[PDB]
């Protein structure tokens, strides 16, 4: 199998750069259209990170920052599969996540919300997908976060995530939400995505059979990255 | 067939998860950073630095930047590189940094990349691929950094020549300086407005 | 009958100038709104072209450039009527067309697509409508054309056309497509038109009863131009 | 695993022999019903063809007959999977195809249509499916072909194909069409198939994500052959 | 479960794709044809020939025929043959031909097949499986060719005996002739009408 | 009532069909062009020339321009002209040109038009109606060219006075020059941005 | 205008030759398919009949055979337009009709039905269409007619008609029925037509506004013949 | 677009309306019949006669036949004839007849037609176009009558040569006989079965 380029990003499946309802985008969006290029080795390659350098609790947000006790909040496991658009598993991709604590408070110098800080919660984790493209992490469900877009704007509970996989063209940062949160329908950030079906692709689903009795709930969330086409005739990449 | 997961902004606290030390969080033993040079890395050491500006001309003090590039011989440290050449074994080819919260300056310590094959037998000029994430940016913005001392190679570069507005090509050329015997390339990014930097859909 | 002005152009029935999904429009669209004016003789007049100066093959794209043989591709006849918005026939209007060959290749210095050139095909024609507003031309069906908007953009098969009729205000250039082409639903150029019904007004229909056995297929395509109102009271045009 | 016989051919899923709307069938169809037999080794075996005897361009109809230049017409890739009725892949099956050129003209002594011949196009190819049952070939999209059934009959664009696989009972020759062609609804040959769902099983689908930028479009078309049952009790085949 | 892809006629130009040399097309180095005998093939060499007739008694001059048969010892050169016996290594067992455009005669050079096991311990008489494709034929027509000098074996053949109209069995028996010391079996096929050849659903 | 056929861009190859000689295509004996002066045409000969610029200040090298105007006595050579006056018989009143592929300059050879009646007894100042088609332009852009030496008439023109932003009226006034005794009016068009040319919905 | 050939007859819009439910067709239908030919002058020409040779009562079935009094039955006028498939009027076409009397009895030597003969009714008429393609005749509404197909078969009330128009290819004989007759749904002759919409095209409609007070009812029935295509390129007819 | 009015059988009493004298009905002063020869008609007088048979070999005694043909110089007496030649003024070119109720014989008195141009510069052999209507026939059956003494012209006729089964062409050739010095062509029609007459879709 000789691989060719990644399939084109479908711009209609993503938010536009200029989205006036999300105010900060007004001055941080290019006026010019993006220039599309044909891919080269630069775009189809990406770094490799070694499993040996990850700590044992890197994917356990409940314990990786606990000092005197456990963090306060809802114990949840999040798991799922990372695949490319043609359904193939994405192996050994680096997945990084970050989030607020149970109060909706971020451990960040620029966050002054009055919701309480939790001395035993950090809010970041990471992991590598396995050979089936599977990932699993455990955390405290984050609380919704008020912010200043319009004065009374509130983000639904959410976890930020980032993927570095096989090709630089697959690089992606997004956020996922939790089934049933009523704030999902009001969020201006989620509303930058033009289509309803794509907005739903960011909602993690309650996975009842995988809850752990007297311990933790569980949410299932799969992620799809761009996929490479195979070449059977001329190989122009090089 | 499946659709790609849609992008969403990184938000203003993107450092909690991608540069926890910048947010004052010590959870990991090994941290990812902006230094791509290991002691045995081959090549010419350079510093790449600059600021990112919004449409009012003000620097973004919450931007996160990553770069991806080839080693000194133009080989990527990736299993997808098909050149059949051995890559420098002490080179990750990638790094991440954040702008300083007060000034907006960002920097990377790296090596000047060698030329990489382009499509159909062409040769690309030396370049670093760069992506920008921040509050207000809905999808990471991709650009490339070329070097002003590689005039000949830039003139023949397939990607630069594919930008039909010739005046905009210059926004992708970093300026070489020499601070204390250290070679520095200054690359400022203007997200919007006059002299707006070219961004690519890759 | 004393004629007054052409009815106002309905801007909602046309694409807007600024259409970000068609990238080239971003820098070639006015920032200011168009200034509407009341019509004068300048806007209600237009030139007259003489039938005597047209060659016998001007409307036959299959033969007007053939040198050594016939062009390769699908032999099709296209016919229809040109009328104004009030249903009146547009007589002796100049209709000019241009298109790619069967490979989707244009005979133009700036076209480097790899689809093969056809030494016996030129790709342009012209004709005058008759007194019933009828026009007919014959050509080779053009192939779809890849182009750089997003990297993998492909135009559906199409024929470009232009009309110069009775009034300068009726001046119009557009493109028509062929019934059933699956690329019609994906085209960013066709999608600049805001309404579905107007997008359908550019699709030429298979006209089976008018196919010529063992020779050519046939498509029917009618065109509507702006129409003049009649005046029964004050005549302010002059 | 001990294999038994192929499942019975479902005659209602195929055209009947006598189909009066396809005129040539009237004198070339048996008056007697076919005699069904229980299968023997004769019916469950088939020949093996060696990959070593195939040339490098046997599946590339764009280049396998090009002499002075490339053929004129629409560059398309066709790919898909061959499986049996129980969903198992058909490995190393011989797939042969043939078709008209872009003008709807066949390179055959008995074809006198006026659509132009293309000196750089032959119109036949072949290939073996791989272990996953996958096949891929590249060609020029054929133009529709007028023929004499009723005087003004026109075949939709189509590619003829033939399969020799594992069992002689699976032997099959058919034709596939292209999504959206308006002639598909009028064709008397396609109408010999009694059911609408089976007529749709011969339509190749536009596969947009697999188009190759500034080069070729792509169609996806899967084929299902008869499948063998496994035996767990008496083995009567022999 | 999936339904079989529906059949469609081969059409009048079936030779472009299945016998390009008959259509005057040289695209392949190795071509498939009607000669099943290689120099070292074992067995008695025979020529099988005939014409195919339509319902008016006229020959089809655009018919394509293929045959499938066992080697001289009744073993098929197929991985699906379960006899546990070694097959002749220089025998494909299959061939393809087209009727002559002017006369309608078709022919194959092959070997007389050995007897093959039938179901439930029976023995089939020597036979060649044949399929016909052409303009006007919506699904390939399957038949078998038995030999008139194998009277005893034919009398006991399971498939011939499963045709309840005894008079129709004879349409499947080819007639042995000897042209120049060459053994020829003549097998004419009548698609429709009087003495219509038996066709099978296999 | 019917809706107008919707407009679509002319695309980058608009010259194949509207100026085949510029695309190097000789199919027509008689071709339409940018010369409106015939030997017996009445009036003052002028050359109208300029460039069209995009929002980055760069010329469009693929733009197609047409003009429509009255003869020297302000009468249109159109059956719809109702003035009851005889028009110059050797004047089409229309022409078409394309910008040069390398420089972007366009030009027409024509005659300076006479004043034409405006609505309700008014008089329009001398003007040429112009339309622009090109890749990126979804609907032909209409504008008018007035002349800087017709100050008095321009001051009273109904259409210029209907533009309420007085500063924008000047974008419609061409500048008279005299190259070699030839009278030239320079008219540059700025599609977007600073000093953007006024475009009309007519 | 140079005329080319008539459009192909759409065989799916007509009954097939072999229709087993209409018993007499079993031995009077060709076994071979019809051979379609390209048209020549023979097929596009037809005779001309002169208006001067028609009698004054040729289109008045109520009076053209009356001897001692008027025929018994329902006084009806039938009128309509004859056009070609492209909607053009068929001028001066010869229209001939024939029918049974009010009892359902035909004045024919081979009719032995017991319904009474009417000494003042003949049952045949003729006329030429005018320049608008209009025809009008007056008659007695025929009664339904029992016949031997199955033993108790009954034809709905009907009038037989024949047209000789501009081209021999337009030659047509058919029958029309009367709105609301319940026998229309049971007739095996009407059921030879395969489609419901075509069966409805033979039903004359009650035309209430055109009834003549205290005198006659009126039915409207239009007829469509094949139409000629116009030629704009090669003229191969000759 | 409209669909053609669907055909229906003429039924067994087709003579009431098309040949009222055969049904014993005198309603018309002028009647249409089977005599195409007027006193001044030009050309060779011939009688065309025969029977129409059903699938059991029995004659149809209720069939109605019409013929359409050109004059002695191959010109049709139709406004649609485009030859630019003058047609015989005393020739309708059409006639209608019914088979005898007892015997099934039908006949026409006409003239032997001259050759008519075929498509693309070809020449058709002399022929008469004939249509048959009757009980049991759902759509009028079209055929043509050629003449056996026009061997050379028939051999070159475009329509006869377009029938690919050569054996069926003979069903369209009438046999010349000479009864009493009268020239008679016998043309029997077999609607179904062996030697079935060719019918056309025109
Ligand atoms: Fe957040
Ligand atoms: Fe075909
Ligand atoms: Fe185009
Ligand atoms: Fe009747």
Curated annotation (Swiss-Prot), chains A, C, D, G:
Family according to the record: Belongs to the intradiol ring-cleavage dioxygenase family.
Catalytic reactions on record: 3,4-dihydroxybenzoate + O2 = 3-carboxy-cis,cis-muconate + 2 H(+)
Pathway terms, separated by semicolons: Aromatic compound metabolism; beta-ketoadipate pathway; 3-carboxy-cis,cis-muconate from 3,4-dihydroxybenzoate: step 1/1
Domain of life, source organism: Bacteria
Required cofactor(s): Fe(3+)
Gene Ontology molecular function: ferric iron binding; protocatechuate 3,4-dioxygenase activity
One GO term (biological process): 3,4-dihydroxybenzoate catabolic process
Role according to the record: Plays an essential role in the utilization of numerous aromatic and hydroaromatic compounds via the beta-ketoadipate pathway.
Native organism: Acinetobacter baylyi (strain ATCC 33305 / BD413 / ADP1)
Family annotation (CDD domains): 3_4-PCD_beta
Keywords in alphabetical order: Aromatic hydrocarbons catabolism, Dioxygenase, Iron, Metal-binding, Oxidoreductase
First-tier enzyme category under EC: oxidoreductase
Pfam families on file: Dioxygenase_C, PCDO_beta_N
Stored SUPFAM superfamilies: Aromatic compound dioxygenase
Subunit (UniProt): The enzyme is an oligomer of 12 copies of the alpha and beta chains.
EC code(s) of this entry: 1.13.11.3
NCBIfam families assigned to the protein according to its UniProt record, in alphabetical order: protocat_beta
Gene name of this polypeptide: pcaH
InterPro entries xrefs: Intradiol_dOase_C (IPR000627), Intradiol_dOase_core (IPR015889), Intradiol_RC_Dioxygenase (IPR050770), PCDO_beta_N (IPR024756), Protocat_dOase_b (IPR012785)
Cofactor: how bound: Binds Fe(3+) ion per subunit.
Protein name: Protocatechuate 3,4-dioxygenase beta chain
Sequence positions that bind Fe cation: 106, 145, 158, 160
Swiss-Prot record, chains B, E, F, H:
Swiss-Prot/TrEMBL keywords: Aromatic hydrocarbons catabolism, Dioxygenase, Iron, Oxidoreductase
UniProt catalytic activity: 3,4-dihydroxybenzoate + O2 = 3-carboxy-cis,cis-muconate + 2 H(+)
One Pfam family from the record: Dioxygenase_C
Pathway listed: Aromatic compound metabolism; beta-ketoadipate pathway; 3-carboxy-cis,cis-muconate from 3,4-dihydroxybenzoate: step 1/1
Biological processes per GO annotation: beta-ketoadipate pathway
A GO molecular-function annotation: ferric iron binding
Cysteine disulfide partners in this protein: none
Free-text remark on how the cofactor is bound: Binds Fe(3+) ion per subunit.
CDD domains found in the cross-reference section: 3_4-PCD_alpha
Signal peptide: none
Known EC number: 1.13.11.3
Cofactor dependency: Fe(3+)
EC top class named in words: oxidoreductase
Binding-site list for 3,4-dihydroxybenzoate: 135
Family statement drawn from the similarity comment of this UniProt entry: Belongs to the intradiol ring-cleavage dioxygenase family.
Role summary: Plays an essential role in the utilization of numerous aromatic and hydroaromatic compounds via the beta-ketoadipate pathway.
Description of how the protein assembles with itself and partners: The enzyme is an oligomer of 12 copies of the alpha and beta chains.
Protein's recorded name: Protocatechuate 3,4-dioxygenase alpha chain
């Amino acid at each position: 199998i000789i691989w060719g380029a990644y399939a084109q990003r479908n711009t209609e499946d993503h938010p536009p750069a200029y989205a006036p309802g999300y105010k900060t985008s007004v001055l941080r969006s290019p006026k010019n259209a993006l220039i599309s290029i044909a891919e080269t080795l630069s775009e189809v390659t990406a770094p490799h990170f070694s499993a040996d350098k990850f700590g044992p609790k890197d994917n356990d947000l409940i314990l990786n920052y606990a000092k005197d006790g456990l963090p306060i909040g809802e114990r949840v496991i999040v798991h799922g599969y990372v695949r490319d658009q043609f359904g193939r598993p994405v192996k050994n991709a680096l997945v990084e996540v970050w989030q607020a604590n149970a109060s909706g408070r971020y451990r960040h110098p620029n966050d002054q919300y009055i919701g309480a800080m939790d001395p035993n919660f950090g809010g970041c984790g990471r992991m590598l997908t396995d050979d089936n493209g599977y990932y699993v992490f455990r955390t405290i469900k984050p609380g919704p976060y008020p912010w200043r877009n319009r004065i009374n704007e509130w983000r639904p509970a959410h976890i930020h995530f980032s993927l570095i996989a096989d090709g630089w063209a697959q690089r992606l940062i997004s956020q996922f939400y939790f089934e049933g949160d009523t704030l999902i329908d009001s969020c201006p950030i989620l509303k930058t995505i033009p289509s309803e079906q794509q907005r739903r692709a960011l909602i993690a689903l309650e996975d009842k059979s995988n809850f752990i009795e007297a311990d933790s709930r569980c949410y299932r969330f799969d992620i799809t990255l761009r996929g490479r086409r195979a070449t059977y005739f001329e190989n122009d990449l090089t | 067939e499946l659709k790609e997961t849609p992008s969403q902004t990184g938000g203003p606290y993107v450092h909690i998860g991608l540069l926890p030390k910048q947010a004052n969080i010590e959870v990991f033993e090994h941290n990812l950073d902006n230094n791509l040079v290991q002691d045995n890395t081959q090549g010419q050491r350079i510093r790449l630095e600059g600021q990112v500006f919004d449409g009012l001309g003000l620097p973004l003090r919450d931007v996160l930047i990553e770069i991806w590039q080839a080693d000194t011989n133009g080989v990527y440290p990736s299993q997808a590189d098909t050149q059949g050449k051995q890559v420098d074994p002490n080179f990750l080819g990638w790094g991440r940094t954040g702008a300083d919260f007060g000034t907006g300056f960002w920097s990377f310590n790296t090596i000047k990349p060698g030329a990489v094959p382009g499509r159909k037998g062409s040769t690309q000029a030396p370049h670093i691929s760069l992506i920008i994430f921040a509050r207000g940016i809905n999808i990471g913005l991709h650009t490339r950094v070329y070097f002003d001392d590689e005039a000949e190679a830039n003139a023949k570069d397939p990607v630069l020549n594919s930008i039909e507005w010739a005046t905009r090509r210059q926004t992708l050329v970093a300026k070489r300086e020499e601070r204390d015997g250290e070679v520095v390339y200054r690359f400022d990014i203007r997200i919007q407005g006059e002299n707006e930097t070219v961004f690519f859909d890759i």
